[PDB]
Amino acid sequence: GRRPARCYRYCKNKPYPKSRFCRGVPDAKIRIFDLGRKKAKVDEFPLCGHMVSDEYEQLSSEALEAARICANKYMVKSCGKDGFHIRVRLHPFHVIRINKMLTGMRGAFGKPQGTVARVHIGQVIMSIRTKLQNKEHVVEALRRAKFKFPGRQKIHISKKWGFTKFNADEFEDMVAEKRLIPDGCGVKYIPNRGPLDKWRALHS
Template sequence: CNTGCLERLGAEVLEAARIACNKYMMKTVGKDNYHIRICPQPINILRINKMLSCAGADRLQTGMRNSFGKPYGKAARVFVGQHIINIRTKDCYVAEAKEALRRAKNKFPGQQVIQVSQKYGFTGLYKDEFSRLREAKRLTSFGTSVAVIRERGSVEKFLERV
């Protein structure tokens, strides 16, 4: 799910999209057949300067003097073309993943695009390149990603550096 505009997504919005996406995927494909990743992290603090709107409020508040405000939420800054939600699943469940992303997309403001990547999982390798390197035993697993062992040097030296 890619964004089409510059925006700030609140932490509540990201959580609502994650719940909608996860609920649909769990119901349709089962909990062991997918992996969801929420890319933007809500680190911007949103603040509010509360103003009174009752009679005599002008004597109780200072207006815009000392108007830094109190924190009331967090938001993530999302840029044009940035990934918001990634789902890694098997090829037979691509239609279900698209539907889950469509449901999550409705929680976001602005315009989002659902894309199917040609890369294998969360790695930066294309599927045919990944299978070729795996058969040659030139991949090292690091959780959800992999590292490619280059032809220079030995495997022991590579693993010492990592």
Template sequence: MGRRLAHCYRYCKNKPLLFCRHLVSDEYKQLSSKALEAGRICGNKCVTKLSLHPFHTIRINKIASDWYALARVNIGQSILSIRCKESNAAVTQEALRHAWYKFLARQNIIVSKKRGFTNMDREDYLKPKEEKRVLQWVSFYALSGIF
């Protein structure tokens, strides 16, 4: 029998991935759902978070019934995100570079200041860890005073 729901999501089963890198847009543009899927596949299982959702619909030809879903992207908005161990940082750079070619316009690849997908900065994480206030078994690194 599997774990109860309270235990399924409370504990982190695998080792946490603490290094995060983002592909960020430099222009205001519209990306189709097909381009987003192609970029995700080029990341080849490295891409752990696709930040955009294609909600905007557009018709290419008024006579035909073709329509496409688009995602509107602002300047500085994240398109793809990858988490990994810090030893595999070069692999994430290469995976995002391959995904970069699937999108039009300019993008930047940036390293996140946060610890994984959490709200904790890297520098702020080290001090509670030395004081043993960080719980390793909680999925999103929380301070022990919260739980």
């Protein structure tokens, strides 16, 4: 059907997103960028497990969807249907072109063939958060999802608390002092620059 991923692996052209100039782009293969028990709080699923790439290459949307399916299936099998949260942090915006030969190379400018995501070295690809007891299951799910991507990517567990930008060790102290207010999937940080009415709303 489509060309092998070897053709569109390297970042050779400038980013070519879908816009007014580039129309007729087929829809991306991946449509759901996060699944599982996404309707959960910060305090119940702190793991912050990440998959980080080491190559400046392009990851196809089909590969992203396949890896998401595999990781979700293994995670459901191991932990449970609502015992984790998987988030994909790559969206296919770059559009690749196809010059199909039934004229030669004259007037060679391809039509939109598909969507691809440009990934830098050290950029997070997929993230999974769950309870502390499921560390082995998280790393196994990420290792299984590695085989659905080209290049070389590492599996890392960060010091952050879940999908937040605050360290896990200092998270509880900040929550206790009400520096951090939970808000759905994430947490809300309140500085001291706000009007005193907002501070009076809390601490009471």
